[PDB]
A paper describes a structure:
We describe the development of a biologic that takes advantage of the proximity of the N-terminus of bound ACE2 to the three-fold symmetry axis of the spike protein to create an ultrapotent, trivalent ACE2 entry antagonist. Therefore, we sought trimeric scaffolds to fuse three ACE2 moieties and leverage the inherent symmetry of the spike trimer to maximize avidity. Thus, we determined a trimeric antagonist fused to the N-terminus of ACE2 would require a short peptide linker and would be less likely to form inter-spike interactions. The collagen VIII trimerization domain is significantly larger than the collagen XVIII domain (44.7 kDa and 19.3 kDa, respectively), but more importantly, previous studies reported that collagen VIII melts at ~45 °C66, whereas the collagen XVIII domain melts at ~85 °C (vide infra). Given these observations, the smaller, more thermally stable collagen XVIII trimerization domain was advanced to develop the trimeric antagonist.
We then sought to prevent the dissociation of the collagen XVIII trimer via the introduction of intermolecular disulfide bonds, despite the high reported trimerization constant (where 50% of the trimer is monomeric) of 56 pM49. Cysteine mutations capable of creating inter-chain disulfide associations (i.e., C®-C® distances less than 6 Å and absence of obvious steric clashes) were identified: G22–F'26, E31–V'37, and G(-1)–L’5. The parental construct yielded ~1.7 mg·L−1 purified protein (n = 1); the disulfide mutants, E31C–V'37C and G(-1)C–L’5C constructs, yielded each ~1 mg·L−1 protein each (n = 1); whereas the G22C–F'26C mutant only yielded ~0.05–0.2 mg·L−1 protein (n = 2). The formation of inter-chain disulfide bonds was confirmed by X-ray diffraction studies. High-resolution crystal structures of the E31C–V'37C and G(-1)C–L’5C mutants afforded clear electron density for the disulfide bonds in both mutants (respectively). Furthermore, the thermal stability of each collagen disulfide mutant was assessed by DSF. The ‘wildtype’ collagen XVIII trimerization domain produced a calculated melting temperature of 84.9 ± 0.2 °C. However, two of the disulfide mutants (G(-1)C–L’5C and E31C–V'37C) either produced very low or no fluorescent intensity up to 100 °C. Considering the high melting temperature of the “parental” collagen XVIII, we posit that the melting temperatures of the disulfide mutants exceed 100 °C. Given the poor expression of the G22C–F'26C mutant with our trimeric ACE2 constructs, we proceeded with E31C–V'37C.
Numbering used by the authors:
A (entry chain B): -1 to 54
B (entry chain C): -2 to 51
C (entry chain A): -2 to 54
The structure:
């Protein structure tokens, strides 16, 4: 398999295409600034610390 | 001028047979275990993931 | 409708010198302290990583 990172502005525009995304791809949604990984039969949210202006 | 990416393998043993050739800074996905790692110098950092969402 | 990716730097100082050219939604790896961030608008969200191990743990 192959992989990469796909991006969407809104949770809506994304969930309209999450079906299209192959397993092992990462998914970013700007609305909530969240990151997911596509797995078999679902998706798993990556745990992120809160936004900061500095790389902490 | 450094770009990496995400690489995926179906099983952990398939990944281990090829990971010597993965540079530091790449992400590694192992599908069978649904595990995601950052490849670092001679090692791995596991990414913390939440439970599967349908 | 966009695509991103993963960019890497050896040091945090070199990364910050370039981060204005990194769009929101890209991932940033820094070899200094082996950190991984999601680039967000004018900032960062640090990925939660477990401590490095020699074997995928």
């Amino acid at each position: 398999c192959s992989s990469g990172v796909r991006c969407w502005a809104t949770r809506q525009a994304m969930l309209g295409q999450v079906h299209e995304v192959p397993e092992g791809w990462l998914i970013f949604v700007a609305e909530q600034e969240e990151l997911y990984v596509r797995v078999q039969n679902g998706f798993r949210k990556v745990q992120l610390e809160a936004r900061t202006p500095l790389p902490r």
